[PDB]
């Protein structure tokens, strides 16, 4: 009635995808943007992925002016394997091993399963998505 088109389309940063979301009594998680291959070829290099991941980890650990611990999902795609496709690259396995033992880049990293992280994580309730 008032001729309003809502929020215009814009890119989403790491600060928005880190938190959990609730859409119609369901749990949703969104992967970070820098692992997108249908936009540019910047995500086709493993060392590039590693350094952007380290920078994003440092930036997220820096401010985090929200409540609750953050959550990052880093799935392994088919492009992360070697030429033979039978093992992950050396950089990837090094990155995961560095993620373990709680020290990677410039921040403390704790790994586990989504079941335990559910009880302690920021949750956002979306109400505008409910049917009219």
């Amino acid at each position: 009635r008032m001729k309003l088109s809502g929020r215009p389309y814009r890119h989403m940063g790491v600060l928005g995808t880190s938190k959990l979301y609730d859409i119609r009594k369901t749990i949703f998680t969104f992967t970070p943007q820098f692992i997108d291959q249908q936009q540019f070829y910047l995500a086709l290099d493993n060392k590039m992925i590693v350094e952007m991941l380290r920078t994003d980890l440092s930036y997220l650990c820096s401010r985090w002016r929200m409540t609750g611990q953050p959550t990052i999902t880093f799935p392994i795609s088919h492009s992360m394997l070697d030429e033979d496709g039978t093992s992950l690259n050396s950089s990837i396995l090094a990155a995961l091993r560095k993620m373990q033992d709680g020290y990677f880049g410039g921040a403390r990293v704790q790994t586990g399963k989504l079941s335990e992280f559910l009880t302690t994580s920021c949750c956002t309730h979306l109400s505008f998505m409910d049917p009219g």
Binding site: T67, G68, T120, S121, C122
Partner: protein, 78 residues
Amino acid sequence: YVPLKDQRNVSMRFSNQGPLENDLVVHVALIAESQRLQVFLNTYGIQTQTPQQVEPIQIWPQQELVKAYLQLGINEKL
């Protein structure tokens, strides 16, 4: 004496919800005791507020109210 239809908003006798109804919602106030305990609770997502952050408001034990009530109703002539 009050008729059955009128007993809806009477003080000290009946509730607003009606005689044959009990759905009262009670407010609770959550206040921490120490800053260390407050931050420990906040680390797990539990939100509590330190007693030093309610400066306009005051929290007193139950003995002060008893003493204040004891102060009332004193007459010197009798």
